[PDB]
């Protein structure tokens, strides 16, 4: 009935049109060391975040899930300021990134001491049921991530802790898959440890263009996410046209009640500013929060996707996911 | 004539008895995501640090080089509070940790953009000549680190940026070697790119117990640090007994003008508190800031080492290094 947001409990029936994976702030681990040349511009960042929320609102979005990992710039008080200003529901996460794009040392050390998995579980429980730091804000989802072609032993501690915390809380699990791999493995390993497939979103599924792969993942009953629309030519990502072709295939197979769509935008980059060089810059020009509604969804309409199906993906699925 | 400390410029003639490598604060990268259960307790942390500064003061220490990496909890305003309270000089660093104990994703990403090495030089320069963040404190040393058996291509970016920055500033370089490897390779690679051997300290050289390895590194003209006295049974460390035996052999060969000593303490761990399991716990029991002066230094004296040699290592060498 309720979900925890950055503005406290909101009824699930009032979530409305929802983007399941968007980052208002994000920084790659290691950004914290470049503070002198890449310090956080709080108020200009707010204006950018707020303006992104307003772009999203102009297409009817009422809720955004922001699954920024704990050490990647997750800032719940900042997200609360966005939501208070814009009236948008924002759900944040508890969790850590995968090995190759994260900071493994800290919890690697605690595995050596033999308390890592228990420490992760305790973090998850605290941030789900009490609050993050002193913000008073509970996370609404557990964020999980796995490496390319592998759920490493390090990563599996988080999967196991996540399953245990979901058994205790009912919290939704949202995942990251690296370069279109481990989708079925993620679902199977979480289920092995008692997670609920109805509360799982396997992410970055648009990273794999083989509809057999998605069907392997869908058979577990989980949700999948085509959540990187507009990312092309980097992090191994396929083209948007490949994303559209794979999605139409599944949708023409009757899989609407399990598919959610998003962009995985980074609206404010933490650390030092940058501009992508000449080739990616072109491929990445549609990586913004209006892309799905200005470009992708008109194309889906022309391919015969009906409003009820879209509405199923943007409204019905998040509502079922969080209830 | 002057070195920058966390209380502005200090004459090199006034540094006195110096510990070349001690961490007041330190956290393994990834500690930033454990904020709810591992918050930084400022008051108590200050109390603990101030006490470490006084324990060092009672054995004549007037200066400490704190080489904590930028993303490992380096906190120059906090260090300044310790120094102002205690009168100790504290010199801090600019630098990143090696791959296996750090967060590479951030600067790995900037290498894809082609800007990483330049960005690292820009960071070194700003922190050495302008200030860290808005603290007004300049780093006094560049901190470098490499992996076990390799100076990776990621690490080499920082090595080349450090050599570049030293050519511009005359700043001292302090290094971390992993598990007794790559001492000769660090010196050779730094000198290849124009770095000054009189301004380099190759660290954790006590991790290697073969005097030929040490002599190989010494042949480059650089300083070397037996800076891990008290660490045993962890991180591949050999015993203090092995440390002493190696150190006596070098001192008996006349190498005292190139050797410096320290413990590499972590006086306040960042993130969540922990307790070492019982095998490691007793082996580590001497890892504190008085161990040199209570245990190691007097046993060296019993073995014939003269007071003027010790003073060369604790006083003469830091003075030579920073001038
Ligand atoms: Fe994401
Ligand atoms: Fe150290
Ligand atoms: O992501
Ligand atoms: O260290
Ligand atoms: Zn992701
Ligand atoms: Zn070190």
């Amino acid at each position: 009935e309720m979900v925890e947001t950055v503005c406290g409990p909101v009824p699930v029936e009032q979530l409305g049109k929802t983007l399941i994976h968007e980052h208002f702030l994000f920084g790659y681990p290691g950004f914290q060391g470049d503070v002198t040349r890449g310090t956080f511009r709080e108020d200009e960042s707010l204006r950018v975040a707020v303006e992104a929320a307003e772009k999203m609102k102009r297409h009817g979005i009422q809720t955004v899930v922001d699954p920024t990992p704990n050490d990647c710039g997750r800032n719940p008080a900042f997200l609360r300021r966005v939501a208070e200003e814009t009236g948008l529901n924002i759900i944040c996460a508890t969790g850590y990134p995968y090995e190759g794009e994260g900071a493994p040392p800290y919890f690697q050390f605690r595995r050596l001491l033999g308390t890592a998995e228990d420490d992760i579980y305790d973090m998850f429980m605290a941030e789900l049921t009490e609050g993050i730091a002193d913000t008073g804000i509970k996370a609404g989802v557990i964020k999980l991530a796995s490496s390319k072609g592998r759920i490493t032993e390090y990563e599996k501690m988080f999967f196991r802790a996540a399953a245990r915390a979901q058994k205790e809380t009912g919290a939704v699990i949202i995942t990251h898959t690296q370069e279109g791999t481990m989708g079925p493995e993620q679902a199977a390993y979480l289920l092995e440890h008692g997670a609920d497939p109805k509360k799982i979103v396997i992410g970055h599924m648009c990273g794999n263009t083989d509809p057999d792969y998605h069907r392997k993942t869908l058979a577990y009953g989980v949700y999948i996410a085509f959540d990187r629309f507009g990312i092309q030519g980097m992090v191994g990502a396929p083209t948007d046209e490949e994303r559209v072709r794979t999605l139409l295939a599944l949708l023409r197979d009757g899989y609407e009640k399990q598919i959610m769509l998003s962009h995985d935008t980074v609206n404010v980059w933490l650390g030092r500013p940058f501009t992508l060089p000449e080739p990616f810059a072109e491929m990445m020009k549609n990586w913004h929060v209006e892309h799905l509604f200005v470009n992708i969804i008109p194309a889906l309409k022309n391919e015969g996707i009906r409003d009820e199906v879209l509405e199923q993906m943007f409204i019905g699925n998040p509502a079922a996911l969080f209830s």
Side-chain angles (χ1 to χ4, degrees), chain A residues 164-277:
Chain A
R164 297 167 56 196
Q166 186 196 76
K167 274 145 74 156
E168 308 259 324
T169 66
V172 167
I173 294 166
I174 293 207
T175 86
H176 163 121
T177 58
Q178 187 55 21
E179 269 161 273
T181 63
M182 305 318 272
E185 284 76 18
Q186 278 192 0
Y189 191 71
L190 283 168
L191 258 52
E192 229 195 293
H193 292 279
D196 178 346
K198 314 193 295 289
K199 318 290 287 168
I200 287 164
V201 185
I202 311 288
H204 310 322
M205 286 284 314
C206 51
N208 186 296
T209 60
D210 178 359
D212 271 334
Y213 174 89
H214 304 251
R215 279 178 208 106
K216 241 173 185 301
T217 310
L218 290 156
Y220 287 90
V222 293
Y223 295 90
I224 63 182
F226 286 65
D227 52 21
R228 284 185 152 178
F229 277 104
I231 301 171
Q232 330 177 104
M234 301 185 65
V235 297
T239 74
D240 274 338
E241 190 204 81
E242 300 176 280
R243 285 198 187 80
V244 165
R245 173 157 45 253
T246 309
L247 171 60
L248 294 167
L250 309 176
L251 284 187
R252 283 160 189 168
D253 250 337
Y255 286 112
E256 53 252 63
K257 294 197 298 313
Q258 282 171 275
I259 291 185
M260 285 175 298
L261 308 188
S262 211
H263 318 87
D264 198 16
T265 56
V266 179
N267 285 282
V268 176
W269 275 100
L270 300 181
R272 193 189 303 213
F274 69 100
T275 75
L276 308 151

Side-chain angles (χ1 to χ4, degrees), chain A residues 21 23 143 204 264:
Chain A
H21 193 128
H23 298 274
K143 175 57 175 295
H204 310 322
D264 198 16

